[PDB]
């Protein structure tokens, strides 16, 4: 396509279906998710957003990222901190898991942010835009399966408080992505990096499924 935002969505549709088809996500969508499983997703997201937001901050003034720098609207670390205190309790920093598949994702995020910052947008796309389109329904499934007490915490990750409308913010984000100027080579690399991002998630999903089924 012309617009990078369209080119990304089109080019990742297949891997996106793979992610939807992953065994752990299938169980999820079918409402079969356990607290143990959900804890692992929350832990994974924490390590992922820590590293991504670290690298966004390192690159916030770079011409290859600045147009999609939206820290107040999108930042997820503090929400995940809140959520992990609930899921893992007061000592969550000492007890949350940090698995090999989580590390592999984090390592690629840091590699991209430090040495290939022009691809960071692929990672921010894969995560943030995903989160905006999807939080709604998967959250509801979670609440049903998990049957939380009404303790007012645990799911802050799924609310972006600084975005009034996800639809309008997603159009704005697409617009800014489409304003990035890149050579055809960089653009091919950005697309490929998004596929890589999806694969990192899929591999993580494969690992969590393994860890939970012994
Ligand atoms: C690894 C997990 C996933 C990632 C990284 C991911 C990522 C994304 C991304 C980046 C988008 C934005 C597409 C665009 O507008 O350009 C998106 C949209 C979407 N995702 Fe996901 N997703 C994942 C899992 C799922 C699952 C499990 C479902 C449903 C069960 C789902 C349903 C959707 C839907 C319905 C859209 C919106 C389609 C549209 O408006 O055009 N995704 N996802
Ligand atoms: C339950 C949910 C958080 C699963 C998920 C992950 C995930 C990744 C890595 C580890 C754990 C979970 N990434 C995206 N999702 C779907 C929610 C966002 N979305 C995207 C498109 N439609 C919705």
Swiss-Prot record:
Catalytic activity: heme b + 3 reduced [NADPH--hemoprotein reductase] + 3 O2 = biliverdin IXalpha + CO + Fe(2+) + 3 oxidized [NADPH--hemoprotein reductase] + 3 H2O + H(+)
EC number assigned by the record: 1.14.14.18
Tissue specificity: Expressed at higher levels in renal cancer tissue than in normal tissue (at protein level).
The organism's taxonomic lineage, starting at the top: Eukaryota, Metazoa, Chordata, Craniata, Vertebrata
Residues the record lists as binding heme b: 9, 16, 125, 174
Enzyme type, top EC level: oxidoreductase
Record flagged with keyword Metal-binding: yes
Cellular component terms (Gene Ontology): cytosol; endoplasmic reticulum; endoplasmic reticulum membrane; extracellular space; membrane; mitochondrial outer membrane; nucleoplasm; nucleus
Induction: Heme oxygenase 1 activity is highly inducible by its substrate heme and by various non-heme substances such as heavy metals, bromobenzene, endotoxin, oxidizing agents and UVA.
Subcellular location, principal: endoplasmic reticulum
Range covered out of full length: 10 to 223 of 288
Site (Important for catalytic activity): 131
Ranges in the topological domain labelled Cytoplasmic: 1-214
Domain remarks in the Swiss-Prot or TrEMBL record: The transmembrane domain is necessary for its oligomerization.
Disease: Heme oxygenase 1 deficiency: A disease characterized by impaired stress hematopoiesis, resulting in marked erythrocyte fragmentation and intravascular hemolysis, coagulation abnormalities, endothelial damage, and iron deposition in renal and hepatic tissues. Clinical features include persistent hemolytic anemia, asplenia, nephritis, generalized erythematous rash, growth retardation and hepatomegaly.
PTM comment: A soluble form arises by proteolytic removal of the membrane anchor.
Subunit structure: (Microbial infection) Interacts with SARS-CoV-2 ORF3A protein; the interaction promotes ORF3A-induced autophagy but is unlikely to be involved in ORF3A-mediated induction of reticulophagy. Homodimer and higher order homooligomer. Oligomerization is crucial for its stability and function in the endoplasmic reticulum. Interacts with FLVCR2; this interaction is potentiated in the presence of heme.
Family: Belongs to the heme oxygenase family.
Keyword annotations of the record: Apoptosis, Endoplasmic reticulum, Heme, Host-virus interaction, Iron, Membrane, Metal-binding, Oxidoreductase, Phosphoprotein, Transmembrane, Transmembrane helix
Locations listed in the record: Endoplasmic reticulum membrane
Gene Ontology BP annotations: angiogenesis; cellular response to arsenic-containing substance; cellular response to cadmium ion; cellular response to cisplatin; cellular response to heat; endothelial cell proliferation; epithelial cell apoptotic process; erythrocyte homeostasis
Name the record gives this protein: Heme oxygenase 1
Topological relation to the membrane, as annotated: Single-pass type IV membrane protein
GO molecular function, one term: heme binding
